[PDB]
Enzyme design. Structure first.
Site, short mmCIF file in Angstrom:
data_model
loop_
_atom_site.label_atom_id
_atom_site.label_comp_id
_atom_site.label_asym_id
_atom_site.label_seq_id
_atom_site.Cartn_x
_atom_site.Cartn_y
_atom_site.Cartn_z
N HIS A 30 40.34 -40.81 -62.44
CA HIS A 30 39.21 -40.41 -63.27
C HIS A 30 39.32 -38.98 -63.78
O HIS A 30 38.52 -38.58 -64.63
CB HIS A 30 37.86 -40.71 -62.60
CG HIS A 30 37.39 -39.67 -61.65
ND1 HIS A 30 37.54 -39.78 -60.28
CD2 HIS A 30 36.74 -38.50 -61.86
CE1 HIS A 30 37.02 -38.71 -59.70
NE2 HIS A 30 36.52 -37.92 -60.63
N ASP A 55 41.48 -45.30 -57.62
CA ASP A 55 41.27 -44.01 -58.31
C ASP A 55 42.35 -43.03 -57.86
O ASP A 55 42.14 -42.15 -57.03
CB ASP A 55 39.87 -43.49 -58.02
CG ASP A 55 39.50 -42.29 -58.87
OD1 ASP A 55 40.20 -42.01 -59.86
OD2 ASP A 55 38.51 -41.61 -58.53
N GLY A 59 33.57 -31.29 -59.73
CA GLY A 59 34.62 -30.30 -59.85
C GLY A 59 35.60 -30.32 -58.70
O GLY A 59 36.68 -29.72 -58.81
N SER A 87 36.63 -33.31 -57.64
CA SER A 87 37.33 -34.57 -57.90
C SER A 87 38.83 -34.35 -57.98
O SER A 87 39.30 -33.37 -58.56
CB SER A 87 36.85 -35.13 -59.24
OG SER A 87 35.51 -35.59 -59.18
N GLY A 88 39.58 -35.30 -57.43
CA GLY A 88 41.02 -35.22 -57.46
C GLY A 88 41.62 -34.51 -56.28
O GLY A 88 42.82 -34.66 -56.03
#
Ligand SMILES: NC(=[NH2+])N1CCCCC1
Ligand SMILES: [Ca+2]
Length: 223
Positions: free
Chosen positions: A40, A84, A175, A177-178
């Site tokens: 995402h 994801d 922020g 994320s990942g």
């Protein structure tokens, strides 16, 4: 990260910032030329920033390297956030040192109750917005699949796990994320999704990296 602590400069040496003119997602360096992040977080024109602490100040240990190729998982579903995960290849190899270092992939999945480290530059408030410029850290346990599924009925697949605190107050946030979830020196999770941040009975949901090691290894070997 809500409810966390300031990590300290370069104490999380595998943490990366994905930059498209501004920080928009985290990721993890898994060898000198490859980063793993959330699908995402996909976009064109990524620059990977290694060795960061303060993302607004050049402090001297940074390496800025453009991406040459990004590979979103073949079965990523943007509606459910199943699978994801994405891989990013760097245009050139990073120079590895004490402050810029790769994180190992797992050989086994981590069990509920294991304590992990979650890190990122995301929002630090559950209500309102305040983005830090330095890296924040949070120690959190993996929750039982039964508690995870009870918090998010009908939404948790075998490729996800919950980590954090059912009482609330401590979580990853926008922020982050990942970014990495590291447990016992191995990358076990990727910051994926949740309902708001740090709310009671709504822990963070993370991509279960151990399910993807074969795909990661084969993809790196041929790209
Ligand atoms: N852990 C959370 N609450 N998240 C994941 C990161 C994005 C916001 C929702
Ligand atoms: Ca910096």
């Amino acid at each position: 990260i809500v409810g966390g602590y300031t990590c300290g400069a370069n104490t999380v040496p595998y943490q990366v910032s994905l930059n498209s003119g501004y920080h928009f997602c985290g990721g993890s360096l898994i060898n000198s030329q490859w980063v793993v992040s959330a699908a995402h977080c996909y976009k064109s024109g990524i620059q990977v920033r290694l060795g960061e602490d303060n993302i607004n100040v050049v402090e001297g240990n940074e390496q800025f390297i453009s991406a040459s190729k990004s590979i979103v998982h073949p079965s990523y579903n943007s509606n459910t956030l199943n699978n994801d995960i994405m891989l990013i290849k760097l245009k050139s190899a990073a120079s590895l040192n004490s402050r810029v270092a790769s994180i190992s992939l797992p050989t086994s999945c981590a069990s509920a109750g294991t304590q992990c480290l979650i890190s990122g530059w995301g929002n630090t408030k559950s209500s309102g917005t305040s983005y830090p410029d330095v890296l924040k850290c949070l120690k959190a346990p993996i929750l039982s699949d039964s508690s995870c599924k009870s918090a998010y009925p009908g939404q948790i697949t075998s490729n996800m796990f919950c980590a954090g605190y059912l009482e609330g107050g401590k979580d990853s946030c926008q922020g982050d994320s990942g970014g990495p979830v590291v447990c016992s020196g191995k990358l076990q999770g990727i910051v994926s999704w949740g309902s708001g941040c740090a709310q009671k009975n709504k822990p963070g949901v993370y991509t279960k990296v151990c399910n993807y090691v074969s795909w990661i290894k084969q993809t790196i070997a041929s790209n």
